[PDB]
């Protein structure tokens, strides 16, 4: 699908793209942005209006195109998995995200020294993905510590991300959800889901499919729980319990790999003291 | 109990209250605050001195009264559960907390554009509760990442909140305590307690009482542990173990719901490899 | 070993040292820093160039010496455990880390009021250790939320610290590593290690040796796991499992304290549904 927008890019003297801000999508209005164009000699960058047009099904081909992809997600124009992001890591620069804006990692010590004549320099982050909220604040959301939501995160109207929640790029919520735990890249949860405090969805060593996971509607993951399998609607994972793809769970009298229960609806995963096993039992 | 204070409110052109700062409680001194009064045309708000008087036992009745309640907690004038907070969620506005101060969520894109003529705009948080430290820094405390303590948190002299700790409103510490994990709203811990790294107190799905919990003195919760029951003094929860209200624990030869041990003193909760159970054993 | 550097100190009118910045180590160039020297009457501090020389094997003896020690670590001049830090807690002041720089905890309310005539005051942290990145951005690293890396952290080239990672002082990575969990003071991990999301290394109640731990090369700790024992190379800890020094693990047909396996290479620690035990099995 064709998509396009007008934004303002921050460029180094090499022409490396540190960032592009697209305040809105599909718009032509350049002169909202003209008074931001210019040179910043302390940072050695220039800011320059650009117009970018892409095909969402093609892999991104340069840095401008990568940035527009992430804005399309966080503006909620497109959902996770409807935009091709292949190769995006090779298109984004590592940047020093400061109170004065993006700065190049090369020669930051000189930049810091020059900027310090204007004020205290604070570094928020050093990464290829900036903090979502500094580019897009989507409507109807709360974010308690906005360090923890990357540009490219999709947060549906009605979502709260608590301070210990985290939402990566190409990930997030498809309806109103309470996110107190960690949503890895590619993962989505649906309406009325509560990801409890410190819970992990698709974390390190949770799975071994060639393929990413999601949760359905009204799933409840307990605090400090984890989930490495796709779940359907109305599933519950007990506080403190990590269900990995390879966890053996007792369901109908025998042990089964949790991956065999992928996509189930209405299951409660919990520890069971009488059997000594993780059990999967029907939710009612 | 009657309480009162003089502060400065930030108001939108509708008269919605974005925030009130009360630098001190019970004071009359208006002209410390007069040079802050004014209009900010970029944000479209005005700042205006107010005096607010409340009864701590009555439910709050407007936004000013809500804000004073949260200041009374974080100034440590009153302890958690001695101030009525019923309805507070309906009195607080969702706000965009920026480096230029509070901004309205409605029309933030225009606000961001106007503010950007003065400097880089950074959004810290989008929420109904601001970061405590921007209103009150209570004496004798350390806070490693101050995104993680909400205004309304009560931190006793001698408390350290580590970077992965979190303290909600109406919650916190009643004596000198090390907080490396997460204290939900309504929860308090007492003197010499260590909430270990990533531990959860009263998290999502930890309990099913009609009622909130607390820990006593000198409780030690291991890293990545959890507790969904009130505990007395000198209790220990093993690292990595979540004790929910419904967890079956082996105590005196039989299995009991952990809720039956609510308020105990001197218990160690740990996994036991010879029984395959969570055991509760006497601390000595 | 003798070490020295030129920096700029922030001093209160008592001469208490709030911070020292040493932009580079072993250098004489004072006049890069002269235009920063001065008085800040709102904060009541002065900034003053200093030259500091220490012996890395001697305990630190004043505040300047403490600060240089932490810079030597985060500049990667010396590795964790090659600099004596005994007594450092008594040499560092508790500071209010603000957007205007370090401020004294004593009389902060007056400082906040004075600074507010220049702009919104934001408090980032209140602690004895500042945020590493505001003093040193080491080359070749990404840090998603830079609140979570203390000055004194050693991050090897090629390291990513994700937003829920944390690295204390005198701790970190000895080669390229993915840090998504929490590295306590004194702990190091080596090349190709992945500390999964929310994992804890040497957290509260994980151990009872008189002595700190480390992980070797290519160790994989699952999300929400924990480790309280030194491990060698190529070890794996299952997602959701905490291996404490006192955890009983099944290895060769009998139960052994995990501390007896300290320093092993090529072990996989996982829950085993058929035995009901934590097992340690060979990695291949």
UniProtKB/Swiss-Prot annotation, chains A, B, C:
A Gene Ontology biological process term: lysine biosynthetic process via diaminopimelate
Catalytic residues as annotated in Swiss-Prot or TrEMBL: 180 (acyl-anhydride intermediate)
Record field: catalytic activity: (S)-2,3,4,5-tetrahydrodipicolinate + succinyl-CoA + H2O = (S)-2-succinylamino-6-oxoheptanedioate + CoA
InterPro entries in the record: DapD_actinobacteria, Hexapep, THDPS_M, THDPS_M_sf, Trimer_LpxA-like_sf, Type2_DapD
Record: residues binding succinyl-CoA: 182, 197, 200, 223, 238-239, 246, 257, 270-273
Pathways involved: Amino-acid biosynthesis; L-lysine biosynthesis via DAP pathway; LL-2,6-diaminopimelate from (S)-tetrahydrodipicolinate (succinylase route): step 1/3
Localisation per UniProt entry: Cytoplasm
Gene Ontology cellular-component annotations: cytoplasm
EC number: 2.3.1.117
Keyword terms of this UniProt record: Acyltransferase, Amino-acid biosynthesis, Cytoplasm, Diaminopimelate biosynthesis, Lysine biosynthesis, Magnesium, Metal-binding, Transferase
Residues noted as binding Mg(2+) 2 in the record, renumbered to the chain: 164
Residues bound to Mg(2+) 1: 147
UniProt-recorded Gene Ontology molecular function terms: 2,3,4,5-tetrahydropyridine-2,6-dicarboxylate N-succinyltransferase activity; magnesium ion binding
Family note: Belongs to the type 2 tetrahydrodipicolinate N-succinyltransferase family.
Assembly behavior: Homotrimer.
HAMAP family: DapD_type2
Protein's job: Catalyzes the conversion of the cyclic tetrahydrodipicolinate (THDP) into the acyclic N-succinyl-L-2-amino-6-oxopimelate using succinyl-CoA.
Protein name: 2,3,4,5-tetrahydropyridine-2,6-dicarboxylate N-succinyltransferase
Organism per entry: Corynebacterium glutamicum (strain ATCC 13032 / DSM 20300 / JCM 1318 / BCRC 11384 / CCUG 27702 / LMG 3730 / NBRC 12168 / NCIMB 10025 / NRRL B-2784 / 534)
Gene: dapD
């Amino acid at each position: 699908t064709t998509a396009s927008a007008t934004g303002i890019a921050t460029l180094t003297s090499t022409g490396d793209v540190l960032d592009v801000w697209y305040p809105e999508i599909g718009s032509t209005d350049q002169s909202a942005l003209t008074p931001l164009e210019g040179v910043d000699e302390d940072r050695n960058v220039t800011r320059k209006i650009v117009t970018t047009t892409i095909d969402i099904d093609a892999a991104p081909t340069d840095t401008y195109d990568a940035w527009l992809r992430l804005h399309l997600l966080s503006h909620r124009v497109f959902r996770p998995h409807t935009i091709n992001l292949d190769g995006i890591f090779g298109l984004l620069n590592n940047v020093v995200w400061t109170n004065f804006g993006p700065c190049a990692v090369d020669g930051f010590a000189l930049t810091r020294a020059r900027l310090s004549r204007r004020g205290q320099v604070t570094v928020y982050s050093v990464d290829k993905f900036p903090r979502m909220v500094d580019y897009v604040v989507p409507s109807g959301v709360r974010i308690g510590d906005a360090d923890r939501v990357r540009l490219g995160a999709y947060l549906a109207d009605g979502t709260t991300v608590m301070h210990e929640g985290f939402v990566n790029f190409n990930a997030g919520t498809l309806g109103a959800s309470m996110v107190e735990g960690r949503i890895s890249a590619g993962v989505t949860v649906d309406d009325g889901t509560d990801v409890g405090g410190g819970a992990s969805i698709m974390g390190t060593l949770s799975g071994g499919g060639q393929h990413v996971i999601s949760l359905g509607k009204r799933c409840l993951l307990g605090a400090n729980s984890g989930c490495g399998i796709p779940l359907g609607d109305d599933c519950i994972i007990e506080a403190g319990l990590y269900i990995t793809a390879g966890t053996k769970v007792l369901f109908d009298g025998s042990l089964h790999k949790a991956s065999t229960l992928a996509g189930s609806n209405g299951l409660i995963f919990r520890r069971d003291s009488v059997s000594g096993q993780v059990v999967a039992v029907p939710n009612t």
